[PDB]
Design a protein around this ligand. Structure first.
Ligand code: 9AJ
Ligand code: 9AJ
Lengths: 438, 438
């Protein structure tokens, strides 16, 4: 049947003819197993005989066969023998513990590192390398195992690295030269004029926005043009400059290939997925957090007022351009072209726009992003919408929105403006839910 | 004042005379810090000028300066770029996470190892090497750091290794030869005869126990001598043999230098400390657990009935010798020499000794060990002791005993015998409290 084998704990010289000579380190195969103190075994040389049971070590008992494990050693005695030894690695039972000495530093320092046991029969240690430097840890794992699937010696970078939008086509270059502008095609028309994609110096992809007669207050616009030019963020359209010497003054800004994210979600639904609109909302929230840090108010925040580039990243645009609108039906709170769908309570009532109103509009933007572009309150009217917002009604939950993101965009719509979240904490929560989704 | 410096995220060619040429990798010292998008810096070559803020990386921002960290990377996109890369170490923000690929095994396997942040500004990873072999882990740490005070390459062993007691002076050697016995000195007198320390064959330290006339039932003793010889344990005195051919029959057993632990704790109080009596109790409990596994009953368990050797380890002795006593005053339950102090309720009442009675006696032994040898119920008498044990009284807590060990030795004294603990769980609890003390 099955055969048993043990190691020679110590060495024994047969005091009796019926005994076998044990020799420390020479494994012996037990021939019979009983409860008596002596059992018959056989040696590699071929001799067999009875031998003491107090001299055998089971195959799995190799722990005792080693010169480190010491079941008798405790967390105190071990430190007393490690101080007299004066770094000695000594193992003791406790499912075990290890002790090492510290060597400079004459005051001996002892550590009691405990050995933990995995539920899957494995063993490890509750100790972390504690790298105070991330690249130092990356280099360590690069030249070590550390229980990883492989060494961290295969960087995962990309070659599609494009510089960011130049904060203006040159320092102090507020006035663009129409001669440099290289009009190429047309990008549609805007509230104040017509757009067209060209190239500054024929080497920088710019989007020229020519104005319409009696559409914007060019004077005030140029007055605050330096201000609006000082606004620069990754998720923010980069205003390159303005050609004011020529009429209509040309607002040369960053170019976005996909155009309005609203149409991107309502027509270009064959280029993204349901797991990316959250990243779009993160981009929008980052832009809003920046413009809030700048004490600037978007004033008009909506998918229509956001653009998307070839890389698929969404960025806010037309930041704070309302102040330079001439259409009364759009500027007035009771006008027809006024976006009541995204407007807020205090706005619609007393015209008290604020960062809280921008947060309300951002919540509406998240709702429509998750709705794929469906218009808010498609069934209601400009007055019924205010009625329902006052009564307490809120936009429903899109079929693709989780309860978490719905709670986010709902907190964005708190009746009390002073209670509405800030864009910073909104971005924090969006990042949290993103890390959870992923 | 203080000087600032950053790294060149990308490379920039001055489109304007007021600009400075940025070159990826060339650190630049920012001359002035503002909120504008362009700031003036100076280069190592000595040239200074305005440069974009979107191209600078703070010194602590080196994370982005590396080609691994990717704040945009998520737990999904990262796995999509790692599968197309097909083990690539890619870091992303999340306070961070790392991803590596698996290479054999054509079905790509990706891991999402998260990077943890210590409260002390350090960084580590929630990953264990998971060594399924203790000596394999010891070898790994022996040739690695693993965040240890030092490599596990300094064994902490001792040269004072003595073989254990030979389970008898030879196999089947039940009858010792008085000629071999080498009587040396005297060790005192016992209940049945007189003792003396000698040497078997002049080479094995043995303790001969010569019997007294009309003190023991030599016939029954020799009858069960093979049985009592089959009892062998580390914390158990090792009966070497019996010379029955000569009168008085000499019980040659293991020699213990310190003698009775009772006198060891009552006179030899200049060789141990208050942190070792717990180990003594552990030794006694191990012996009791073994003799319980053997369905053998000590019958008389007490510090007096335990010996100690030069190494300071205590071992039980005279295991089950009561059956071979001739003194009626000691055998009878109502006799004068009967140890009522250690006796149990059922014993004193109906004479129903059992493993529960042995557990009671072991609790009493622990109490007296922690009392330094004080006699149990020094004020009471044989009858008042039973009175108080029946009423519910129990031995008090020695000044050196913690509430935990007191609860242990108190559970040892449960009124209901069927409820008294087992020696196995008692040893488990003693080991637990020992690891806690240490
Ligand atoms: C999507 C493709 C589809 N393609 C079809 C498919 O085969 C042909 C045609 C092209 N089309 C396309 C591509 C790219 C772009 N990109 C860009 C659009 C615009 C743009 C265009 C028209 N109106 C506007 N708006 C709309 C908002 N708004 C304006 C002014 C004001 C507002 C609100 C206000 C009240 C604050 C005032 C305003 O100007 C804008 C945004 O400035 C600006 N910039 C810089 C671009 O890069 N757009 C569209
Ligand atoms: C401590 C030093 C001090 N030293 C002084 C200091 O300067 C001089 C003198 C020596 N002394 C000393 C040293 C070593 C030893 N060791 C040994 C003691 C004994 C021993 C001695 C006397 N009585 C007994 N008992 C006592 C218990 N018991 C006996 C028989 C029975 C019992 C109970 C019963 C009812 C079941 C029956 C019985 O025999 C024993 C235990 O067997 C046996 N063995 C094997 C030893 O190795 N003892 C004493």
């Amino acid at each position: 049947t099955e055969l048993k084998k043990v190691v020679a704990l110590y060495d024994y010289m047969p005091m009796n003819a019926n005994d076998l000579q044990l020799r420390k380190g020479e494994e012996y195969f037990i021939l019979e197993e009983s409860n008596l103190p002596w059992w018959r075994a056989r040696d590699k040389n071929g001799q067999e005989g009875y031998i003491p049971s107090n001299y055998i070590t089971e195959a799995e008992d190799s722990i005792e066969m080693y010169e480190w494990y010491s079941k008798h050693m405790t967390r105190s005695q071990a430190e007393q023998l490690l101080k007299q030894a004066g770094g000695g690695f000594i193992v003791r039972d406790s499912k075990y513990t290890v002790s090492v000495f510290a060597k400079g530093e004459p005051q001996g320092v002892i550590r009691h590192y405990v050995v933990c046991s995995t539920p899957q029969s494995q063993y490890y240690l509750a100790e972390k390398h504690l790298f105070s430097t991330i690249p130092e840890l990356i280099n360590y794992h690069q030249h070590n195992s550390a229980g990883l699937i492989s060494r961290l010696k295969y960087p995962v970078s990309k070659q599609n690295k494009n510089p960011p939008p130049p904060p203006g086509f040159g320092y102090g270059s507020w006035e663009i030269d129409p001669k440099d502008l290289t009009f190429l095609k047309e990008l549609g028309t805007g509230q104040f004029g017509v757009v067209k994609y060209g190239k500054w110096r024929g080497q920088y992809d710019v989007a020229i926005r020519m104005i319409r007669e009696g559409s914007m207050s060019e004077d005030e616009f140029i007055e605050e043009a330096k201000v609006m030019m000082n606004l620069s963020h990754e998720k923010l359209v980069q205003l390159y400059g303005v050609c004011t010497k020529q009429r209509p003054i040309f607002i040369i800004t960053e170019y976005m290939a996909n155009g309005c994210l609203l149409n991107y979600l309502r027509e270009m639904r064959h280029r993204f997925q349901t797991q990316q609109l959250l990243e779009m909302c993160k981009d929008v929230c980052e832009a809003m957090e920046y413009l809030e840090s700048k004490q600037f108010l978007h004033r008009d925040l909506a998918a229509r007022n956001c653009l998307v580039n070839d890389q698929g990243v969404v960025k806010v645009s037309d930041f704070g351009m309302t102040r330079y609108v001439l259409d009364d039906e759009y500027t007035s709170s009771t006008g027809s072209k006024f976006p009541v769908k995204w407007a807020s309570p205090e706005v619609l009532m007393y015209s008290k726009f604020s960062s809280k109103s921008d947060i309300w509009a951002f919540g509406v933007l998240m709702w429509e992003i998750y709705s794929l572009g469906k218009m808010p309150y498609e069934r209601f009217t400009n007055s019924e919408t205010a009625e329902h917002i006052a009564q307490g009604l809120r936009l429903p939950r899109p079929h693709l929105a989780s309860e978490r993101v719905y709670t986010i965009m709902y907190s964005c719509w708190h009746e009390k403006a002073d209670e509405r979240p800030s864009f910073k904490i909104l971005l924090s929560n969006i990042l949290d839910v993103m890390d959870e989704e992923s």
